[PDB]
Subunit: 232 residues, 4 copies
């Protein structure tokens, strides 16, 4: 299977697969069952910002998801990523809807990786082109006429659809560790807009890092956020 | 054919296709016959550094190739690139040898493109991996066990071979212009080592920007630096 | 006197000191009488963005001032800055009002200088603190309770005042050239808001680079944009 | 007194003030008595590199000091810096010698701070000017004719002197936290050369962050690394 490290913004509590009973953010290391989570007071219809960081000395993957003036939710997990992930990876955003639904709209995304002693990679998109040639769009993901990356299916009127999954990967593999590296670090930020007509919107957005040839796993819809073939 | 904009570090004077009669640096806009050139006092066996810059307001593509303490050769050409090139491009280095030869070794390469009003892309390599997954290596290009990108064929003992061509492209397409852009800029630097046993080494190195699906043209060896199908 | 290089966003045409007869942007090299200007369709009450760039190989100082969806005004001037300016400088924004007036509000400012072969400096402010300890505020300049840098005096109700001058300098000197530099480049962007009740607002905003110990010259009000002691 | 957070590269074990009995790196939060230390196999006469990072979500200040091919020493400490330090700070390097001595030569130094939701500051020096106008040199610190920052006194022949203290601060205050910040991060790297004729070289180098008006405390020589007025 793929190897996945992700920060999930999990709008829908699947308590039967170990979610806490409230929307949350989480760090997922090779499992949808987050190694650490924090309650997330999700604000439907407001633009959120997630900042994710790691470096290989501190070995603490952290994320903060905020909405202006209202909340900032943080979660951290200690982990040596460079023992979990392959040396080369692709980085991406995923999102799903399931029985319930929400827009999983990405308005901007930036990422920086540095490998020091050697390499760096930085990209940032404050809008997305109609044909984002440097994105690998998987499943339902497309960019819309406003320049937004719609991870999951939305109709022409902007309404979200259920049973959707989409991911966008940055086109270049990222060399996130090498044997002779002194320290490897990455930072990612994206802003997102989750709107939903559903009382319990679902399912959420992740920023994820995986093997380069990552693809949406069969069976990864809904609660598995397009990342995992099962809930193990 | 491809659309090519390049800065060439042209070690070998092909005066029959319009080179000046001395090694030179040049700016090539859709032709091997540089729109502008400057004499280049090439220093075989010393590590050189090239810095190339452009922005769409100034519309002046400039390059400087230097060697520590000995020379700095500059060439500039006024050109609206964003009318020459497609909106999406790949950026790359090329090099060739022909009847005569030289190592066309790249020790580091960095590139930054920004599109403002929106996007940026930056990569830098101070060494290259044995399997540079974020490079598209074309023709003869490989990375060597010292971490160098050898654009053209070198033998196990490091000796350069003739009739070689190689290019390395950055894996991600780069969005170097969009209609609604206020200004688009790029900068590139690479350091290189050209060694040769030949009295008149050849043929040279370029940094080039092309259509995304650029490939080495048939017939582009030697004097055409792996960039053009002919000398027109 | 100071040595000044500036890009002026000159809202008020002082045709008696060589302004064109319309609002314009200009590049000023040691004189308020711009070496080059472009007509600027100034949009009072809308937020503008200026991007200024230079590098010492291309030797073309360029600026573009835009407002979203309405205009982009560009001006360029060929000049070897590193023969005009001292090796160390301070960079700043200035603005003035005179008999007529306008707000000269700066909402963000970023600047990057690189000296290559060696040094870089980058700062960016997307809002300004109540006590911007890394700004040297000269004359009337202050930051306001919205986080804006008000270059020239505004009253508590936000109304601009006449006969005002203010500048903000970045606190650190910037080493913008050294003898052994291969190339020196800088980029600056700032966004600004010029509002005025006056039919002919005045006087304008500049981004400027000067000797480190630059101060507002006596007599530099109004048309001289806080930069020059006279109109020579 | 000043408020000091530092990463110390402590070449000399002052076990009477709580040093471990071997050269070490340490994180010091308002005390010379490190909150955390790691054994440092100091390599006199070889160029070392220190990378220090922090961000306010992870709240883990980490440092790694390495020498090519021989060692990489890491130390981390969990700490909410933005509760320890003032919102505005100066960042600097310090070094001392005492009864014993060593060169505390800085060959390069870079620093990046970002405050997000807003501001960033980055500087890097790969050599230092004879008159580093953007450094506040305190005590003995000077730059030498090779472009190195000699924190502590060295004679014309390059030999280190005892009873020396010197610091260099970056000239601009750095806004490292604000109430409304979502996350604040900083990274610093410097490379250094510690040479000594002494069997037990002393005393060490730090990178430190302090109140803006920080100055070398009286009594801060030798073991107190120019940072603290006493060993408490
Ligand atoms: O809201 C999105 C969620 O919808 C689905 O599961 C259910 C959520 N509420 C339910 C109610 C009834 C039944 Br049966 C099902 Cl499967 C569900 C599942 O598809 C989950 O994986 C997904 O996270
Ligand atoms: O040195 C590299 C050069 O070698 C070739 O051409 C010649 C260079 N010197 C010559 C001498 C004789 C003859 Br015939 C030829 Cl084709 C050449 C050609 O292959 C050129 O395109 C290339 O630039
Ligand atoms: O609007 C700002 C301008 O106001 C002043 O000059 C005048 C602008 N309109 C005028 C009308 C009459 C007279 Br007298 C004067 Cl000095 C002026 C001068 O202060 C100019 O330097 C300044 O640019
Ligand atoms: O080597 C540098 C060290 O020299 C000094 O202390 C001594 C180190 N070795 C000693 C031996 C004897 C005596 Br007395 C003293 Cl004070 C010392 C002190 O100055 C320490 O603060 C400093 O770290
Ligand atoms: Ca869930
Ligand atoms: Ca040639
Ligand atoms: Ca004027
Ligand atoms: Ca000690
Ligand atoms: Mn979850
Ligand atoms: Mn040529
Ligand atoms: Mn003017
Ligand atoms: Mn210690």
């Amino acid at each position: 299977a793929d190897t996945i490290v992700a920060v999930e913004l999990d709008s829908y509590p699947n308590t039967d697969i170990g979610d806490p009973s409230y929307p949350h953010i989480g760090i997922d290391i090779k499992s949808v069952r987050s190694k650490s989570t924090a309650r997330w007071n999700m604000q439907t219809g407001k633009v959120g910002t997630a900042h994710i960081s790691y470096n290989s000395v501190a070995k603490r993957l952290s994320a903060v998801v905020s909405y202006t003036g209202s909340s900032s939710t943080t979660v951290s997990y200690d982990v040596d990523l460079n023992n979990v992930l392959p040396e080369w990876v692709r980085v991406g955003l995923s999102a799903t809807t399931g029985l319930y639904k929400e827009t999983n709209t990405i308005l901007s995304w930036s990422f920086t990786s540095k490998l020091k002693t050697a390499n760096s990679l930085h990209f940032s998109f404050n809008q997305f082109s109609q044909n984002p040639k440097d994105l690998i769009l998987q499943g339902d993901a497309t960019t819309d006429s406003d320049g937004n990356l719609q991870l999951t299916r939305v109709s022409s009127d902007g309404s979200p659809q259920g049973s959707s999954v989409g991911r966008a990967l940055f086109y270049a593999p990222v060399h996130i560790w090498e044997k002779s590296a002194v320290v490897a670090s990455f930072d990612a930020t994206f802003t997102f807009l989750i709107k939903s007509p559903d009382r319990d919107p679902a399912d959420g957005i992740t920023f994820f890092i995986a093997n380069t040839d990552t693809s949406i796993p069969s069976g990864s819809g809904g609660r598995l956020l397009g990342l995992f073939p099962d809930a193990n």
